[PDB]
Symmetry: D2
C-alpha cells in the first residue's frame, strides 16, 4: 500500500530509510507522503511524536510503526536489525492494528484552538506565578498554585507523567491523568496532591485567576497563549493506530525500559 | 422491600437505627437480615465495609446505603439529619443504582482461598523480610523487596492507596491499582516505584522467593497465610451496587473530604 | 538606634508603617535607610525577602524584624496588632539576635557573579532541555536531566524545597539542601532522586553538558545567564540576623503554618 | 593492638577471617574479643550492624572496619581482595579515625530502656492502628495516624530513610531525621508529610493516644514494648569511630551504591 518513512536525520537513520525504500521497491508499495496508509518513523520517540503530528488529520487512515536507532523508545517496536523482516511483513500485510487513546486540549480566548496529544499537554505560566482554578465537569475542585499541571494519555504515563509521580496506566484504559508540578500547600493554599485519573467524557477545565497568559505544551511543542479564558482537557474520540507484527506487551515494554534489558 | 440496618454501636447510631426502623414500619417494608434487598449502614466507612462483607455472597441482590454519624465517610451519602428523608425515598423506591468495581484476591497453597475487596488487599511478610516476584499476565516484571504491596479498587484509591502515593481514579473505570510500600532501590535491587494501573482481565501474581508466610489484609481484615505459593489479583466480575437518591459526584466527594467542606 | 521600615505598599501596610514611625519619634531613634541597624519589613515573606536583598551588603550590621499584615509569613514574628508593643521593645533594645544560615551561588562565564539567597537558588534551562553534570567536591556525582534543580537554605526548606519533597531542617543546622524538579529516570538516565543535604564547606557545582544558557533564580529574582561554564553552591560565611523579643520556636512556626493555627 | 573479626558465616567470610587472623599473627597483634581496639566485620551491612551492637558499650575504645564479601555495603571500605593490604596497614597503625553520629532512643513505661542506633529506630503498632502525638521540645507538633515513623541517623539516611523519601545527609552533620510511613491525610487528619531534620539537643517524644503497645526496631532488631508512656529520640552524645586508610568520600560511596559502579 501507500507508505512513507520519516527519519531523525542522522546518518544511521537516513541510510536505514534509504534501504527500506529500496526493499519496498521490490513489492506493490508506493512511496506517498501525502496520503500514506503506513507511516514508519526511524529514530527515537521524539521522531515518532513528530510523525504523529505530521499526520494528525488522517489518523483513522494510517497505521504507525516505530524503529529505534538509539536505545529502546517506547513507541518503537523494532530494532534497526529487523528492518528487512519488517519490510517483508508489511509487504504481505494482514497484520493487526492496536489503538491507543489520545488527549484533546481546547484553548479558549477573547477564539478557540484545539490540539491532540499522544504523550501529554502541560500548562505553566508565561512567567510570573501560575494560579488556576481546576473545574471538573463544572464542579470547582481546587485552586492550584505552583509550577504547572500535566495531563497525560495512557501511553504518556511512562513519560513526563512518571517523573511527576503519576501512575503508569495500561493503554487499553480510555482515560487521562492529571499530575501536579510543585504545588504550594500550607494552611492557606491546598491542592489534592495526588494524581487524578479521569474517564472518557469527563472534562477538566483550567480557569485563570489573575494572569491570563500561559505556556501550553503538547508533546514536544510549546506555545505561548495570551488572553486565555479556559483550557479544557478531555479524552479524544480519535485514536492512534499501530501496525503490530508480534506480541510486545505494554508491561513487558515497561519492564524493558525501566527495570532491565 | 426487604431491608436491614447495621450500626456502629454507639448510642447515636443505635438510636438512629431504631428510629429508621420505626419509620420503615409505616411502609410496605419488612426487616430481614437474611435476604435484604437494601442494606443501610449507620456509622463510618469501617461500618460500611463490615456491611459489605456481611453480604458479600448476595451482592447482586442488594443495594447499599451509608449514613455517616461522624465526619463524612466516603461510602456515606447521607448525614443523620436526612434519615427521615431517606426512609421516605427508599419507601417509594424507583431510585437508580450505581455500581463500583471490586478486587478479587486468590491465595494458593500446598488449597485455594478467594477474597473480595471494596477498598484494597495488601500483603506484607509475617515478620522477616518481604520479597516477592511480581508477575503480570505471566511476564516476570520485577522482584519487589520492601515493606509490602497494596492493590486498590477505584473507590479504594482515596484510602490506603492515596497514602502510598497512588492516583485517585474515578470508579467508573474498571481497574485495580498496585502501589509499593517502602521498596529498596540501589544498584542491586530495582522496582518500578510508580503506581501501576491494570485493566479488567489482567492478572497480577505475587510469587514467594524465600519465605512463604504472609500477612494478607482485605479491607479491615488481616489474616496470616502459611505456605503460600501464589497470590493472584484481578478485577472481579462482581460489583457493589449503591442506591442513589441525588447527585453526589465522586469528584465532589473527593473535594469535600480532602480539600474543604 | 538607626532603623528603617519597608512596606508591601497596600494601605494597611503603609498606614502601619506611618504609625510605627510616629511611635519611634517618641524615642532616641533616627529613621535612616542608608545605614540602619534595624530593618522592619511590613508585609509578607516576599516583602521580607526584598528587605533582605536591599541590605545584603550590611547584613552584619543589621537586625531584621518581619510584621505580617496578611496571613502568617514565615519570616514574620509579629502581627500588626503588636506593632506598638514592638516599638517599645525595640526602643529599649537589649533584645537578643538569632542568626540563620545563607546560600552563596557563584555563576562563572567566558566573568563571575555571586548571589546570596535567604530561601533558595534554582536553575532551569533557558528553554530547551535542562541537562547538567552535578559535581560534589570535584567528584562527578550524576548527570541530571529534567526540569531543574533547587538549592535551599535551612529557613528556605519550608518554601519551594518543601513542594519538591525536601526535608524541613532546623535553621541552627549550617547546611544547604538540593532537590530535583521532575528528573527523567529510565534504564539510560539515572539520578539519585532523594534530596541531598550538604554541610558547610562542601561545594556543589553544576556543569553544562550541551546548552550553556540557564535561568537562575535567587529568592524572588530570576535572571537569564548566557554562556555559563559553572554554577557553584556553598553555604555562605554570611548570616542573617533577626531581632528576637520572645520565644517563637521554629518547630512551632512550622506547626502554625502547616498543621493548624 | 587488640583486635577481633566477626564473620557473616558463609564459607567465603569464614575463610577470609581465618586468613586475616593468620596474617595478623605475623605482627604485634593479639586476638581479643573481650576488649578489642579494632573490630573488623566481614560480610555485609547487617554483619556490620551486628558488630556495632556487640560492642556498643565500648564505642569510645574501638575503631570499626567493614569488608564486604557481597556487593558494596555502605559501612564497607574494603573488598575481600584488599584484606592483605588491610592487615599490613592496620598492623603499622597511624591511621586516622572518622566519627559518625548515633541515635539514642529512650522507652518509658509504667521503667526505662535505652537503645543506640547506627541506622535508625522505627516504631509501629503492635497490631491495630498506630496513633501517636509527636512532641518536639515539649511543643505538641502533630497527631500522627498511619503505618509508623522512622528516625534515622545521618549514615542511616541511605537506608530505610531513603525508601521513605527522606533526604540523604552527610554524616558530619550532627542530626537525626524523622520520616513518615503512610500517614492518613484528609480534612480531619493532618501531618506535616515532609521529613523533618533535627539538630543535637532537640528531643522528639512520641506519646500514645489510645493503644500503648508498640513494636520498636533499632537497626535489625525489633522488640514488642508494652504499656508505653513515651518514646524519646535525641542525637546521642556517643559516636561510632571508623579506621580510615584512604579517601572514600561519603558522596562517592552514595554515587557508587545508587548511581553506578
Ligand atoms: C527530560 C526531557 N525530555 C526527554 O528527555 N524526553 C525524551 C526521553 O523520553 C522518552 N519518552 C518519550 C519521549 C519523547 C520526546 N521528548 C523530546 C525530547 C527531545 N530529544 C518529548 C517528551 O519528553 C517528555 N518530558 C519532558 N519533560 C520531561 C521531564 N522532566 N521528565 C520526563 N519526561 C519529560 C514529555 O513526555 C515529552 O512529550 N515518550 C515516552 C513515553 N511515552 N514513555 C516513555 N518514555 C518516553 C524518550 O524515549 C527519551 O528517553
Ligand atoms: C490509618 C488507619 N486507617 C484508618 O484510619 N482508616 C479510617 C479512615 O479511612 C477513611 N476511609 C476508608 C476507611 C476505612 C476503615 N478502616 C478501618 C478503620 C477502623 N477505625 C480500614 C481502611 O483503612 C485504610 N488504611 C489502612 N492503613 C492506612 C494508612 N496507613 N493510610 C491510610 N488509610 C489506611 C484502608 O484503606 C482500610 O481499608 N475507606 C475510604 C475510602 N475508600 N476513601 C477515603 N477514605 C476512606 C475513613 O473514612 C477514615 O477517615
Ligand atoms: C508558588 C509561588 N510562590 C509563592 O506563592 N510564594 C509565597 C508563599 O510562600 C511563602 N513562603 C516564602 C515566600 C515567598 C515569596 N515568594 C514570592 C511570592 C510573590 N507573591 C517567593 C518564594 O516563593 C517560593 N516558591 C516559588 N515557587 C514555589 C512553588 N512551586 N512551591 C512553593 N513555593 C514556591 C520560593 O521559595 C520563593 O523564594 N518563603 C517561605 C519560607 N521560607 N517558608 C515557608 N513559606 C514561605 C509565603 O509566606 C507565601 O505563602
Ligand atoms: C528491605 C529490607 N532490608 C534490607 O534488605 N536491608 C539490607 C540492604 O540495606 C543496605 N543497607 C543497610 C543495611 C542493612 C541490614 N538490614 C538487615 C538485612 C538482613 N539481610 C537492616 C536494615 O535494613 C533497612 N531496611 C529495613 N526495611 C527497609 C526498607 N523497606 N527499605 C529499605 N531499607 C530497609 C534498615 O535501614 C535496617 O537497619 N544499611 C545501609 C545504609 N546505612 N545505607 C545504605 N544501604 C544500607 C544493605 O547494604 C542491603 O543492601
Amino acid at each position: 500500500m501507500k507508505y512513507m518513512i520519516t527519519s531523525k536525520g542522522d546518518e544511521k537513520s537516513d541510510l536505514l530509510r534509504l534501504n527500506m525504500i529500496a526493499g519496498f521497491g521490490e513489492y506493490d508499495m508506493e512511496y506517498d507522503d501525502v496520503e500514506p496508509e503506513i507511516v514508519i518513523s526511524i529514530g527515537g520517540d521524539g521522531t515518532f511524536l513528530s510523525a504523529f503530528h505530521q499526520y494528525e488529520e488522517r489518523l483513522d487512515e494510517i497505521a504507525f510503526i516505530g524503529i529505534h536507532t538509539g536505545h529502546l523508545g517506547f513507541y518503537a517496536d523494532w530494532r534497526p536489525a529487523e528492518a528487512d523482516k519488517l519490510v517483508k511483513l508489511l509487504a504481505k500485510g494482514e497484520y493487526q492494528k492496536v489503538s491507543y487513546p489520545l488527549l484533546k486540549t481546547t484553548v479558549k480566548y477573547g477564539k478557540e484552538a484545539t490540539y491532540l496529544a499522544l504523550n501529554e499537554s502541560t500548562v505553566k505560566s508565561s512567567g510570573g506565578p501560575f494560579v488556576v482554578d481546576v473545574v471538573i465537569n463544572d464542579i470547582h475542585f481546587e485552586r492550584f498554585r505552583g509550577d504547572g499541571l500535566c495531563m497525560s494519555t495512557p501511553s504518556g504515563t511512562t513519560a513526563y507523567n512518571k517523573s511527576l509521580g503519576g501512575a503508569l496506566m495500561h493503554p487499553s484504559i480510555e482515560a487521562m491523568q492529571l499530575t501536579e508540578m510543585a504545588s504550594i500547600n500550607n494552611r492557606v493554599y491546598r491542592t489534592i496532591g495526588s494524581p487524578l485519573v479521569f474517564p472518557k467524557h469527563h472534562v477538566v477545565s483550567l480557569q485563570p485567576v489573575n494572569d491570563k497568559d500561559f505556556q501550553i505544551s503538547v508533546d514536544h511543542l510549546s506555545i505561548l497563549h495570551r488572553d486565555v479564558q479556559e483550557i479544557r482537557y478531555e479524552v479524544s474520540a480519535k485514536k492512534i493506530h499501530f501496525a503490530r507484527f508480534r506480541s510486545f506487551p505494554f508491561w513487558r515494554r515497561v519492564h524493558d525500559s525501566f527495570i532491565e534489558d
